[PDB]
Write an enzyme that holds these catalytic residues in place. Structure first.
Site, PDB file in Angstrom:
ATOM      1  N   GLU A  77       9.749 -23.080  25.042  1.00 48.91           N
ATOM      2  CA  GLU A  77       9.707 -21.930  24.158  1.00 48.91           C
ATOM      3  C   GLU A  77       8.454 -21.941  23.287  1.00 48.91           C
ATOM      4  OE1 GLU A  77      13.496 -21.323  22.089  1.00 48.91           O
ATOM      5  OE2 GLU A  77      12.679 -19.493  21.155  1.00 48.91           O
ATOM      6  N   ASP A  95      10.433 -13.704  14.362  1.00 48.02           N
ATOM      7  CA  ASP A  95      11.626 -13.772  13.544  1.00 48.02           C
ATOM      8  C   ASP A  95      11.292 -14.011  12.076  1.00 48.02           C
ATOM      9  OD1 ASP A  95      12.539 -13.520  16.144  1.00 48.02           O
ATOM     10  OD2 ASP A  95      14.213 -14.973  15.842  1.00 48.02           O
TER      11      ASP A  95
HETATM   12  O1  LIG Z   1      22.696 -15.910  22.184  1.00 46.09           O
HETATM   13  N1  LIG Z   1      22.910 -16.042  21.034  1.00 46.09           N
HETATM   14  O2  LIG Z   1      23.161 -15.102  20.376  1.00 46.09           O
HETATM   15  C1  LIG Z   1      22.913 -17.375  20.455  1.00 46.09           C
HETATM   16  C2  LIG Z   1      23.820 -18.378  21.151  1.00 46.09           C
HETATM   17  C3  LIG Z   1      23.923 -19.620  20.741  1.00 46.09           C
HETATM   18  N2  LIG Z   1      24.841 -20.463  21.498  1.00 46.09           N
HETATM   19  C4  LIG Z   1      25.898 -20.993  20.943  1.00 46.09           C
HETATM   20  C5  LIG Z   1      26.988 -20.802  22.057  1.00 46.09           C
HETATM   21  C6  LIG Z   1      26.200 -20.815  23.272  1.00 46.09           C
HETATM   22  C7  LIG Z   1      24.708 -20.665  22.775  1.00 46.09           C
HETATM   23  C8  LIG Z   1      23.917 -21.947  22.988  1.00 46.09           C
HETATM   24  O3  LIG Z   1      24.475 -23.036  21.786  1.00 46.09           O
HETATM   25  C9  LIG Z   1      25.631 -22.452  20.687  1.00 46.09           C
HETATM   26  C10 LIG Z   1      23.105 -20.072  19.512  1.00 46.09           C
HETATM   27  C11 LIG Z   1      22.314 -19.200  18.893  1.00 46.09           C
HETATM   28  C12 LIG Z   1      22.198 -17.740  19.397  1.00 46.09           C
HETATM   29  N3  LIG Z   1      21.328 -16.799  18.697  1.00 46.09           N
HETATM   30  C13 LIG Z   1      20.798 -15.519  19.187  1.00 46.09           C
HETATM   31  C14 LIG Z   1      19.252 -15.525  19.277  1.00 46.09           C
HETATM   32  C15 LIG Z   1      18.835 -15.127  20.708  1.00 46.09           C
HETATM   33  C16 LIG Z   1      17.611 -15.898  21.215  1.00 46.09           C
HETATM   34  C17 LIG Z   1      16.285 -15.209  20.879  1.00 46.09           C
HETATM   35  C18 LIG Z   1      15.131 -16.000  21.560  1.00 46.09           C
HETATM   36  N4  LIG Z   1      13.877 -15.319  21.305  1.00 46.09           N
HETATM   37  C19 LIG Z   1      13.550 -15.372  19.889  1.00 46.09           C
HETATM   38  C20 LIG Z   1      12.079 -14.945  19.747  1.00 46.09           C
HETATM   39  O4  LIG Z   1      11.636 -15.017  18.428  1.00 46.09           O
HETATM   40  C21 LIG Z   1      12.019 -13.478  20.097  1.00 46.09           C
HETATM   41  O5  LIG Z   1      10.690 -13.056  20.007  1.00 46.09           O
HETATM   42  C22 LIG Z   1      12.438 -13.423  21.558  1.00 46.09           C
HETATM   43  O6  LIG Z   1      12.337 -12.096  22.010  1.00 46.09           O
HETATM   44  C23 LIG Z   1      13.866 -13.916  21.711  1.00 46.09           C
HETATM   45  C24 LIG Z   1      14.222 -13.826  23.189  1.00 46.09           C
HETATM   46  O7  LIG Z   1      13.328 -14.690  23.894  1.00 46.09           O
END
Ligand SMILES: O=[N+]([O-])c1cc(N2[C@@H]3CC[C@H]2COC3)ccc1NCCCCCCN1C[C@H](O)[C@@H](O)[C@H](O)[C@H]1CO
Length: 762
Positions: free
Chosen positions: A732, A535
């Protein structure tokens, strides 16, 4: 034919990893089940204690699969502090008939030492069926107010034919109410509500349950039941029994103290219907098989041969393979191909934001996906480059399973060659994702790590459940046919990368062996490059159409090397010749555009204020890419300098593994510090495998690679084990100063690669 046997073996499972416990078959519109439970101590608490979708907070000690194989089933254990409950959910598949076989589950709840011994717990089994021409009916009670024994649901559909689903009476104290209300509602017993809603909302189990409980409460209010003399909470929250026909069936039980009950799904087209005796026996059998397969497939080498490491490996593995979900529905895609997405100008991120602000995105599909996932509580859905890592251990376990998942993924690919990097399929999947983050963009790539799995299958190919798991390597004909049918999509993805993720050599003062080989990730912002998977790893500032990214070129290298092997197996000689020249050009172009002699590593490149090619060097993972992706010859002087960087404690080498970014880099530990210092298992895994490669071949770096391999394997495994021991979780990422796991828990997830690292013998 092997395809049909695989289809049938894998049809059923607990394929809803977004909830604590539920089942669905690999059919978009069919029968699903979910478990809910919660203690009730007051008139208002159940709504706060009730569990259904997975989460992780102070109220939940931990949960996960002790044991799992999606052909056979497994045992999950849930440790709930809020509800004073240690739960066990055993699920087992029984093959037979023509409809994907039968299955059964046991739900066992044991109060912990802290819980009131006379705790009342509400348990719900929620069952839904989508599909226009299908039926499901609860066979009514003999008794007046509910069920003294088993609840039987009879249903039918095209997909499943005839079936019966039984929720058994179970064991445990059933509280009895002395209240007036008992004359209308019964003293306390198992109840069933049979309802119908439009198919598309059936997934909303909690709101649907609560709407029924509220109607229950409103009936009390209307009928002179009050604070003068109120029924006990558990009776107030016990639904009036009304079994029937519908597409929703709520089965509710209340228990005092410990409890257990079975769920028995009996496929009519099969033998005799499933019994609880059947369940107990097949549970025991499945455990034995899991035991024996583990010891063969994941035979942990020194110094991890001990039982503590074995139990750790089993936990990490089972959680990863236990994450397998089936997802179905529409995704949200911007199909405008707005010209701003070409990012050809300076300041392009502002153009792209202006385009996104047109909100031309629309739902499309429906699609299905069968995939493992990074995180049950936080992101239970398919992520493209993650799946490449997840399938490495799964493939060892069951290559046919892995190939199925690969197939499932490639079936999403659009005409141009694009698969969305994040697969949010259906309203249920969307519910966990803020609107602002749902939209997929057809110019956004992600690393093609699924080629890594393909590579290992190819090497396996060169050199009924027992049978079915390895049928694709044991019958070369099957293997080849699979590659035959996938090969065109692989090739289409290759071509898509070079069309959409092209970098600009020809337009600047850029000299290199090839005019062709140069790549830039689309989608970057000032602070981020999400599509690369890393990221917030620091990139040229500001972002610029002239940027070139050494990780992306290295991935194109991984791809082309794979196309060589696969093409060579299908005798596509016109293709293999073309690849051979692309590979050759990337090797040269890696050096000519990306190598810094002065820094001693690969760097991304930009274009100056003065319109000239500048290297922008930030020592970390990115810097190692050609080595991580297996592109350098084992005698390369550059490889040796890279080995110096890796082993250097003042740069990347921490006691806990390799730091994402050097301690010397100006961006170390800045901003969100996501990929700017923490230790990440996926990249560590690639490093460990490449160190091993160099350590097991004659060359000048053999003995260095051997030492680094030995230590890094040890450090990575021990950090992940230590954290698992103390917290119960896979994490993670890992802190390079303290070794603590940080960011999100339940990351299984590429953290589980550790099973394979312990396994060794690559
Ligand atoms: O789901 N959401 O969109 C999302 C939801 C929430 N929430 C809100 C409401 C419920 C939930 C929990 O608390 C409050 C908070 C932030 C996000 N952000 C999106 C990001 C997606 C995660 C990426 C993780 N990793 C990142 C690595 O860098 C990459 O390499 C890897 O591939 C990827 C996957 O493993």
């Amino acid at each position: 034919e092997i395809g049909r046997l695989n289809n049938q073996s894998l049809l059923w499972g607990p394929y809803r990893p977004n909830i604590y416990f539920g089942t669905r078959p690999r059919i978009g519109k069919s029968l699903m089940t979910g478990l809910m439970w919660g203690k009730i101590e007051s008139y208002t608490d159940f709504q706060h204690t009730v569990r259904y979708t997975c989460e992780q907070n102070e109220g939940m000690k931990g949960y996960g699969w002790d044991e799992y194989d999606p052909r056979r089933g497994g045992i999950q254990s849930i440790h709930d502090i809020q509800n004073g409950l240690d739960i066990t959910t055993s699920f087992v598949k029984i093959p037979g008939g023509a409809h994907g076989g039968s299955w059964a589950a046991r739900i066992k709840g044991t109060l912990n030492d802290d819980a009131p011994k006379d705790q009342k717990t509400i348990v719900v089994f929620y069952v839904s069926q989508e599909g226009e021409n299908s039926e499901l009916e609860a066979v009514p009670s003999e008794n007046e107010f509910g069920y003294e024994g088993d609840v039987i649901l009879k249903g039918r559909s095209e997909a499943l034919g005839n079936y019966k689903l039984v929720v058994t009476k179970g064991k445990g104290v059933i509280p009895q109410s002395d209240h007036d209300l008992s004359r209308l509602r019964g003293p306390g017993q198992t109840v069933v509500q049979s309802l119908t809603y439009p198919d598309e909302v059936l997934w909303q189990a909690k709101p649907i349950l609560f709407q029924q409980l509220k109607a229950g409460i409103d009936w009390l209010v209307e009928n002179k039941y009050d604070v003068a003399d109120p029924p006990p909470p558990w009776q107030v929250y016990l639904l009036a029994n009304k079994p029937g026909s519908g597409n929703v069936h709520i089965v509710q039980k209340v228990f005092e103290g410990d409890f257990e009950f079975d769920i028995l799904f009996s496929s009519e087209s099969a033998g005799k219907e499933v019994t609880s005796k059947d369940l107990e026996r097949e549970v025991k059998q499945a455990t034995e098989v899991f035991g024996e397969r583990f010891a063969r497939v994941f035979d942990l080498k020194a110094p991890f041969q001990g039982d503590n490491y074995k139990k750790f490996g089993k936990s990490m593995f089972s959680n990863l393979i236990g994450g397998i979900g089936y997802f179905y529905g529409h995704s949200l895609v911007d199909r405008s191909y707005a010209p701003e997405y070409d990012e050809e100008n300076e300041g392009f991120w502002e153009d792209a934001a202006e385009a996104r602000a047109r909100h031309q995105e629309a739902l499309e599909g429906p699609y299905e996906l069968f995939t493992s996932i990074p995180s049950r509580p936080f992101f239970p859905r398919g992520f493209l480059w993650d799946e490449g890592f997840h399938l490495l251990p799964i493939a060892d376990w069951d290559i046919d399973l892995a190939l199925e998942i690969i197939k499932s993924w490639y079936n999403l690919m659009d005409e141009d060659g694009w698969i969305a990097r994040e697969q949010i399929l259906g309203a249920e999947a969307r519910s966990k994702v803020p609107k602002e983050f749902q939209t997929q963009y057809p110019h956004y790539a992600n690393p093609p790590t699924l080629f890594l799995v393909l590579d290992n299958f190819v090497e396996r190919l060169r050199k009924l459940d027992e049978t079915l798991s390895t049928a694709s390597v044991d019958n070369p004909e099957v293997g080849l046919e699979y590659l035959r049918r996938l090969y065109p999509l692989l090739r289409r993805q290759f071509d898509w990368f070079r069309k959409t993720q092209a970098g600009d050599i020809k337009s600047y003062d850029r000299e290199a062996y090839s005019t062709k080989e140069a790549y830039r990730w689309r989608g970057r912002t000032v602070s981020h490059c999400l599509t690369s998977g890393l990221d917030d790893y620091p990139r040229p500032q500001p972002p610029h159409p002239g940027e070139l990214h050494v990780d992306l070129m290295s991935w194109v290298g991984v791809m082309v090397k794979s196309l060589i092997s696969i093409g060579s197996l299908l005798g596509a000689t016109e293709d293999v010749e073309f690849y051979t020249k692309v590979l050759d050009a990337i090797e040269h172009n890696l050096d000519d555009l990306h190598w810094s002699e002065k820094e001693g590593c690969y760097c991304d490149a930009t274009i100056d204020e003065f319109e000239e090619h500048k290297l922008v060097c930030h020592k970390g993972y990115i810097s190692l890419f050609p080595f991580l992706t297996g592109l350098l010859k084992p005698d390369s002087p550059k490889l040796g300098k890279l080995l110096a960087l890796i082993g250097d404690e003042s740069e990347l080498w921490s006691p806990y593994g390799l730091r994402s970014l050097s301690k010397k880099d100006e961006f170390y530990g800045t901003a969100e510090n996501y990929w700017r210092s923490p230790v990440w298992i996926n990249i560590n895994y690639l490093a460990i495998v490449q160190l091993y490669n160099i350590a097991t071949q004659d060359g000048p770096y053999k003995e260095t690679a051997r030492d680094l391999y030995t230590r890094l394997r040890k450090n990575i495994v021990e950090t992940v084990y230590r954290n698992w021991e103390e917290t119960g979780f896979a994490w993670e990422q890992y802190n390079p100063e303290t070794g603590k796991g940080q960011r999100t828990q339940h990351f299984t997830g590429w953290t589980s690669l550790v099973v394979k690292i312990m396994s060794g013998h690559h």
